[PDB]
Structure formats: structure tokens, C-alpha cells
């Protein structure tokens, strides 16, 4: 194939490490219920979280669609499930800081960024990059505190 291929393995290990985990069928309403679908494909994911303050204490995710979308979300949610609000706001600031600074997450936990960096930038995956990442952003992220 005349492509970089640099994404396949990334999300392969992503969908594979997550296979060890529960799948892409979980939803709750103890806090916030985030839903995002890409009508262009069939891509849809639901990040339902449980944040009793400024911490994500639980997060259940439902996903169906492209192999990368349902993979990146469920992997990074599994990682996000163990974060705080400030940290995840930083994950969104980091997503913004990456493309300009060349560095990214000082913790190197990039479950979504790794999988979606290749997604975010294809005309065929960009609507899915809004699907997955922006939903993840709409879950506990914002990039900027408000400035
Ligand atoms: Zn798609």
C-alpha cells in the first residue's frame, strides 16, 4: 500500500490492549453523559462519566463505527477513567500544544492522541477525529481554562 502505515500498529495495540478490558458497551448517568456520532459513517461513541467534583471516578463508554474510533476512545477512556478534570483539561491543552510545541503529554499517556493523530488529519477520518477526540474533549476537556 502507498501509505505511511504508521497508525495501524498504534491502534492495533490500542484495540488489542483494550480487548483485555471490557468492550465498547457501557453507559451511566451519575454525572455527565457524552454522545457523539458521525452520520457520515455510522461512527458513534458515548462517554458516560462519573465525576463527583473535579475527578473522574468512573467512566463507561459505548462505541461503534470505524476500527480506530471505537479503539481510541475505549483505550483513552480506560486511561482517562483514572485522571482528574484538571489533568484532562491539560490533555486537551496538550493536544493543542503538541502540534505547535512538538512535545505533548509530559506523562506520555496518549491512548487517544496516538491513535487519533493519524485520524484527525485525513478528510476521511477528520469527522471521526471530531467524533472520537472532540467527544473525549466534551467529556472532561476544554484545552483552555477560559483564556
Ligand atoms: Zn468514520
Swiss-Prot record:
Major enzyme class: transferase
EC number assigned by the record: 2.-.-.-
Null mutant phenotype: Essential, it cannot be deleted. Upon depletion cells grow very slowly while aconitase and succinate dehydrogenase, both of which contain Fe-S clusters, have decreased activity. Upon depletion no change in reactive oxygen species is observed, while a modified bacillibactin (BB), an endogenous siderophore, is produced.
GO biological process, one term: intracellular iron ion homeostasis
Cofactor binding note from Swiss-Prot or TrEMBL: Bind 1 Zn(2+) per monomer.
Subunit structure: Interacts with SufS; this interaction enhances SufS cysteine desulfurase activity. Interacts with frataxin/Fra.
Name of the featured protein: Zinc-dependent sulfurtransferase SufU
Species: Bacillus subtilis (strain 168)
